[PDB]
Paper text:
The Rho-family GTPase Rac1 activates the WAVE regulatory complex (WRC) to drive Arp2/3 complex-mediated actin polymerization in many essential processes. The WASP-family member WAVE exists exclusively in a 400-kDa, hetero-pentameric assembly named the WAVE Regulatory Complex (WRC). The studied complex is composed of a trimer formed by WAVE1, Abi2, and HSPC300, and a dimer formed by Sra1 and Nap1 subunits. Rac1 binds to WRC at two distinct sites—the A and D sites.
Using cryo-EM we determined structures of both WRCD-Rac1 and WRCAD-Rac1, as well as WRCapo (WRC without tethered Rac1) to ~3 Å resolutions. The overall structures of WRC in these three complexes were similar to the previous crystal structure (WRCxtal), with a root-mean-square deviation (r.m.s.d.) of 0.83–1.22 Å. 187-230, which was not included in the previous WRCxtal construct, did not show any density in the cryo-EM reconstructions, suggesting that this region is disordered in WRC. By contrast, in WRCAD-Rac1, the density for the W and C helices and part of the meander region were not observed in the reconstructed map, suggesting that upon Rac1 binding to the A site, these sequences were destabilized and released from the WRC. Consistent with these observations, the pyrene-actin polymerization assay showed both WRCapo and WRCD-Rac1 were autoinhibited and could be activated by the addition of free Rac1 (blue curves), whereas WRCAD-Rac1 was basally active (solid blue curve).
Author numbering:
A (entry chain B): 822 to 981, 988 to 1121
B (entry chain E): 3 to 106
C (entry chain A): 5 to 26, 57 to 337, 341 to 367, 380 to 539, 542 to 574, 578 to 784
D (entry chain C): 24 to 177, 499 to 518, 528 to 543
């Protein structure tokens, strides 16, 4: 029994009161304090990725061979560690999202004219502009509380060879993709409608993947759409593979882990439902939702 | 630029589709009767092969062009509406400024 | 001007960006064809008879013999009803000639000398199809008491005007009157005309044995075929048990197996005869000639496994297991991959058929067994019979389970139809490969044996099978082949060609019947000469080639395996009302029953399933337009959809707004207050979560050829509600 | 029969299928184009209105702006549009190909001609097929259920506001729509 109630500090009303007290300066300070921890966790994740690079590089290329892919997965190390770290990152990003929503609601209500100008400016920036200007625009908007596709605080925090770093980012996406079905075996992965999510917080992975992909592949000048598309292909393939199993222990929570693909595609501003349909039939998700909501 | 499409591209392609419909309906009967009353059946046969290949290619080409024209038309309209939304938002902001000035 | 250009056009057309979207055999063949034509004509008459609505219920009646306008209503009625009576005359002539033809075939086939030769299994199945056609036609004519009244009214009107003068005309009219007046006329004629034939029961025993065999081995794909087997079994048993024949003596000789048929009927007790007119299968046993003294033999006459909620665990398991594997398969390929796609297509079709069968069987059993006011506490005393067959006959769980199963059927159907090109290519390639491998490689050994032997009947047949279905990649059969001569192989590799094209229906049928001829118990036997492995491999190929015809037409069979059109039609129960009703209320319609149950209970789990229960209307309307082929049926379906969809939109919008208003109110409530209230046993309960997101994103719902933007209508209603809320607050 | 005859017949058949496909594609494209054209008309009208409104708004005078305190309520309030779509499955809405396949289906018997002789003065065909029957039955059920439920249940600105409340009281609010029937039923149920 913790000596406090978490809902009496993170409620919508409480977060709005905190925004009233703190203002944009205090909220920016809070966000920076959170991105520090995210950067720490990402450093650890990069360590784990580099200590697996050979097997990961092979898995990135042999996703068409179920037997060879299973053989490769057998040799990976520290998988539950990767999942735990990404869950922590997702939890921190969820807290940030709550705080940003509170701040936006307060600001749009105290200073409507500045907020209207800011929103008009952000919405209609030419999509052909480069990263330098868009970063300043997004930084202003985020200070105002609006939500942005690419978080500028995270982009700044994750910058503290370059081609080696790009390769490491791609293999981090691969690692996290292929490790998902390990969550079915866990017993705390139950999806609860009273929670609208899982007991052990694996529903924040949507935040984790989307935000981390955006940040890294803006830092290393990639293509966020393509990288997230590859991640979706791999994750869908892995979960489809676990689909045919029959063990009553390694598939205790197949439906709950299936719902994560839907959560990820919903959160992402780069992934649409057409891609998910092409790679993962939606009837499976419909049946999973029926099963959990029983 | 949108008028060039609306007035004559899409309607022209639709009329072309109707013409192809009629021509193919006639060519089917022509090929059948030609084979029936042909001295050499083999020659009639590869001729029918040629007509069917030509018909398939032409229909595919026409459908492709119509689809492209419709796609471009929709995209242009979406761009217009985005621009007009921006202008309307500006007008709303101006009206709000005026009302606040009057109140002050 | 070439395949390359056309194919390139198609390819470039299939890549545009489309987002935001989510001898002794020829005579047999000829007779078989004629019999099939008679079958289709009989189906036409059956549909004519099912959708017959009384036209004499609208003709004004005459009270006094001096009604001022009596002649000129008689002229009206004769002109109205002349073509309907033409239809009935044609029906009578058809049934008479059909019985003549069937009995002629049965007589020819049973001839003492000819009872030795074989008859292809396909011919036996077609004979079963006639016996079933006669059964359905007789029962239809029995139910429909409106045709009698229509003909009587026409006859009175026509005689009052002296419209008929000829002697032949009066004789034909009075023959039609006899036909319509009687009861079980068609079956009685069939019996009286069969029994004159000596030893007719042996052919029927053959039919029933074949049907029992097929049903046991699961040699069917569509639910229609599965039920046809049982109907043929039952009606064949009924016919066989006449005066000159006794099925219990015939069973004592181990000629038929009554225990197997009894077990089958016990497991499955009702099947849809036509439309919504069911047939209880034990009714054939009950009414047989010698049933009473042998009543103890059957246990299918008493009365369990129709609780659809029991099969749902298995249905869900199979759904997920199959779709997970199918989703993996979404350049030239090896034969193994094409064979896998063939297996997967067949397996998906079988699963779809099985699910459709579950749903329809439950529906039929429910229809034949209406509830009462003691069984169901909520059933009102003044409940119509149809209202008691459908509306009050289902529990909540049963309705939810039916919706689940229908949704699974429709989802898997769209998935399977999406892969129609890959399945077509894979299926054709596998069929061609299997047929050519068999013909060219497997038939070399038996042909060599037969050449090394005096017997030449086998040689003629095997050689005939080779001419029929061999595609010699060099155009001619190899000449230095030693197997053809007789000498042993030294070897002699032959390269079998590959290509994606299936055998025409005629030649596939010929090949299958000739193979059946070789491995035949009766033919002095052709199977005696053959060796062991030869017959074993022939039996194999003959068994797998059963489904080739079905699979080559993948789209049609996929359509057939997922047919749920009959849940709407109610002509039978409408006829039983004796004119009291012209149609039933929507709250008695099955699709609306299911959809409205989901809407009213506000079930969270089932909220994603509603649109499939609505979709049922599409299948029903398409069926009415294309098969029944009647305008007024589509008019009625359209009116029903018009009313029910507006009701659906209203209810959905109302409950959506209520749900989100409650969530908004609950989010902002003080948390410490909730804690305190719970600590004193006065909990302010949370609102149950629910799944409305999928519905709010719908923008091209499809109903009866219209595209409906659900989002727009929900927005209109919700905005009205928001304005009302603000006004109420102020 | 020679096989080449069958192959040629099949080739003619596929050409006929190509022609049918052409007609169906034309139908789809026309259905798209018509509504796109309607959108274009609406967009042009809205653009004209926006241009007018912008030139009008640029010349608003705040210092000269005068507000009538006395006329606060006697002014007519602005009301947003309340259009709500219904009857989406009327016969008018039928697509063209579905109508084509509907018109080849068998028509009901010409049972209307009996109408002039009927004493009841009802249509002849309404005894053969009544699509309006469902609606009538539903309405009747709704009406009696509602009645049964009801039975079972049982300064100068000061002048301006006074006039406003008087108008609101006197100018109160003032059917064959399903939504209205359901609303009345539920309202009586409360």
């Amino acid at each position: 029994e913790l000596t406090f109630n978490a809902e009496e500090y993170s409620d919508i009303s409480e977060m709005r009161s905190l925004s009233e007290l703190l203002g944009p300066y205090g909220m920016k300070f809070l966000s920076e304090s959170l991105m520090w921890h995210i950067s720490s966790q990402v450093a650890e994740l990069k360590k784990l990725v580099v200590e697996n690079v050979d097997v990961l590089t092979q898995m990135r290329t042999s996703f068409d061979k179920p037997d060879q892919m299973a053989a490769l997965f057998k040799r990976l190390s520290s998988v539950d560690s990767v999942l735990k770290r990404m869950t922590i990152i997702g939890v921190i990003l969820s807290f940030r999202s709550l705080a940003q929503e509170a701040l936006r609601d307060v600001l749009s209500y105290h200073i409507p004219f500045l907020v209207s100008s800011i929103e008009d400016f952000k919405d209609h920036i030419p999509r052909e502009t480069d990263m330098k200007v868009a970063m300043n625009v997004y930084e202003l908007s985020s200070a105002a509380g609006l939500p942005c596709e690419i978080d500028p605080a995270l982009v700044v925090a994750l910058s503290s060879s370059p081609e080696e770093e790009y390769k490491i980012a791609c293999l981090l996406m691969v690692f996290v993709a292929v490790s998902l079905p390990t969550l079915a075996s866990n017993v705390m992965s139950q999806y609860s409608p009273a929670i609208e999510g899982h007991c052990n917080n694996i529903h924040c992975l949507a935040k984790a993947i989307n935000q981390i992909a955006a940040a890294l592949f803006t830092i290393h000048k990639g293509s966020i759409e393509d990288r997230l598309k590859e991640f979706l292909a791999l994750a869908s393939s892995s979960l489809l593979k676990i689909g045919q199993e029959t063990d009553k222990t390694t598939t205790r929570n197949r439906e709950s882990v299936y719902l994560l693909l839907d959560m990820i595609v919903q959160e992402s501003p780069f992934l649409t439902m057409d891609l998910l349909e092409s790679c993962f039939p939606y009837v499976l998700l419909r049946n999973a939702y029926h099963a959990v909501y029983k | 630029e949108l008028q060039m499409l609306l007035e004559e591209e899409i309607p022209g392609g639709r009329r072309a589709l109707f013409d192809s419909y009629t021509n193919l309906e006639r060519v089917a009967d022509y090929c059948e009767n030609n084979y029936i009353q042909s001295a050499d059946k083999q020659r009639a046969l590869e001729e029918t092969k040629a007509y069917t290949t030509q018909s398939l290619a032409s229909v595919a080409y026409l459908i492709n062009t119509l689809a492209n024209n419709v796609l471009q038309m929709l995209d242009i309209q979406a761009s217009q509406l985005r621009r007009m939304e921006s202008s309307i938002n500006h007008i709303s902001q101006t009206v709000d400024i005026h009302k606040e000035k009057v109140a002050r | 001007v070439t395949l390359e250009d056309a194919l390139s056009n198609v390819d470039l057309l299939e890549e545009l960006p489309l987002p935001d979207q989510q001898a002794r055999y020829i005579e047999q063949a000829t007779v078989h064809s004629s019999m099939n034509e008679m079958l289709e004509e009989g189906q036409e008459y059956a549909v004519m008879l099912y959708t017959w609505r009384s036209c004499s219920r609208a003709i004004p009646q005459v009270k006094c013999n001096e009604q001022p306008n009596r002649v000129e209503i008689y002229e009206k009625t004769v002109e109205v009803l002349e073509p309907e009576v033409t239809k009935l005359m044609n029906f009578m002539y058809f049934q008479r000639n059909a019985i003549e033809r069937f009995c002629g075939e049965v007589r020819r086939l049973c001839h003492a000398e000819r009872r030795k030769d074989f008859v292809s299994e396909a011919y036996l199945i077609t004979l079963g199809k006639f016996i079933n056609m006669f059964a359905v036609l007789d029962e239809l004519k029995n139910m429909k008491c409106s045709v009698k009244n229509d003909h009587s009214a026409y006859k009175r009107a026509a005689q009052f005007l002296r419209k008929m003068a000829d002697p032949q005309s009066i004789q034909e009219s009075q023959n039609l009157s006899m036909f319509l007046a009687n009861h079980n006329k068609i079956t009685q004629s069939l019996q009286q005309q069969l029994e004159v034939i000596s030893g007719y029961e042996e052919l029927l025993a053959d039919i029933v044995n074949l049907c029992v065999d097929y049903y046991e081995n699961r040699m069917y794909l569509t639910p229609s075929e599965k039920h046809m087997l049982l109907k043929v079994m039952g009606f064949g048993l009924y016919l066989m048990d006449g005066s000159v024949s006794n099925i219990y003596k015939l069973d004592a000789k181990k000629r038929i197996n009554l225990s197997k048929i009894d077990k089958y009927f016990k497991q499955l007790q009702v099947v849809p005869l036509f439309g919504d007119m069911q047939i209880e299968l034990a009714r054939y046993i009950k009414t047989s000639a010698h049933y009473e003294e042998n009543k103890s033999r059957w246990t299918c006459t008493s009365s369990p496994q129709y609780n659809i909620c029991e099969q749902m665990i298995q249905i869900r398991e199979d759904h997920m297991r199959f779709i997970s594997e199918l989703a993996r398969y979404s350049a030239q390929k090896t034969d193994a991959e094409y064979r896998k796609l063939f297996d997967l297509a067949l397996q998906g079709l079988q699963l779809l058929s099985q699910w459709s069968a579950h749903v329809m069987e439950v529906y039929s059993w429910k229809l034949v067994h209406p509830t009462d006011k003691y069984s169901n506490k909520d059933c009102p005393d003044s409940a119509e019979e149809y209202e008691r067959a459908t509306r009050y006959n289902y529990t909540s769980e049963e309705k939810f389970a039916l919706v689940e199963v229908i949704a699974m059927i429709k989802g898997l159907q769209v998935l399977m139809g999406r892969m129609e090109s890959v399945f077509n290519h894979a299926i054709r390639h596998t069929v061609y490969a299997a047929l050519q491998d068999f013909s060219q490689v497997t038939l070399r050994e038996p042909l060599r044996q037969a050449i090394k032997k005096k017997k030449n009947v086998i040689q003629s047949v095997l050689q005939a099978i080779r001419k029929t279905v061999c595609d010699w990649e060099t155009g001619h059969e190899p000449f230095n082949d030693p197997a053809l001569r007789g000498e042993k192989d030294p070897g002699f590799d032959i390269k079998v060609p590959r290509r994606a094209v299936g055998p025409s229906s005629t030649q596939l049928y010929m090949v299958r019947t000739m193979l059946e001829s070789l491995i035949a118990d009766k033919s002095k036997t052709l199977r005696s000469s053959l060796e062991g492995p030869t017959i074993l491999d022939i039996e194999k190929f003959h068994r797998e080639s059963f489904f080739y015809t079905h699979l080559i037409n993948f789209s049609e069979t996929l359509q057939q395996c997922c047919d749920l059109s009959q849940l709407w039609f109610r002509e039978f129960f409408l006829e039983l009302t004796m004119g009291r009703r012209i149609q039933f209320p929507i709250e008695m319609s099955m699709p609306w029953i299911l959809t409205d149950h989901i809407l009213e209970t506000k079930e969270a789990s089932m909220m994603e399933y509603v649109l499939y229960s609505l979709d049922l209307y599409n299948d029903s309307a398409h069926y009415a337009l294309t098969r029944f082929n009647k305008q007024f049926l589509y008019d009625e379906i359209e009116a029903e959809v018009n009313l029910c969809f507006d009701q659906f939109v209203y209810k959905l919008a109302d409950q959506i707004f209520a749900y989100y208003k409650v969530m908004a109110g609950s989010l902002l409530l003080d948390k410490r207050l909730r804690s305190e209230c719970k600590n004193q046993g006065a909990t302010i309960h949370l609102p149950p979560s629910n799944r409305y997101e999928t519905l709010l994103k719908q923008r091209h719902v499809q109903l009866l050829g219209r595209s409906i933007d659900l989002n727009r209508l929900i927005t209109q209603r919700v905005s009205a509600a928001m304005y009302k809320s603000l006004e109420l607050a102020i | 029969n020679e096989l080449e005859c069958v192959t040629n017949i099949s080739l003619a058949n596929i050409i006929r299928q190509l022609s049918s496909l052409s007609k169906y594609a034309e139908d789809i494209f026309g259905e798209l184009f018509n509504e796109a054209h309607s959108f274009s008309f609406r967009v042009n009208s809205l653009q004209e209105r926006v241009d007018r409104l912008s030139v009008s708004v640029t010349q608003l005078d705040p210092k000269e702006e005068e507000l009538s305190l006395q006329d606060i309520t006697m002014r007519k309030a602005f009301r947003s549009s309340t259009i709500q779509d219904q009857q989406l499955f009327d016969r008018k809405t039928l697509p063209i190909p579905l109508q084509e396949t509907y018109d080849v289906c068998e028509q009901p018997p010409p049972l209307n001609i009996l109408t002039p002789y009927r004493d009841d003065g009802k249509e002849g065909l309404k005894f053969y097929t009544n699509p309006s029957y469902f609606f009538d039955l539903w309405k009747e059920k709704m009406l009696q259920d509602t009645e049964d439920k009801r039975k079972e249940k049982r300064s100068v600105l000061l002048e301006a506001i006074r006039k406003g409340i008087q108008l609101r009281k006197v100018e109160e609010q003032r059917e064959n729509d399903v939504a209205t029937i359901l609303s009345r039923r539920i309202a009586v149920e409360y």
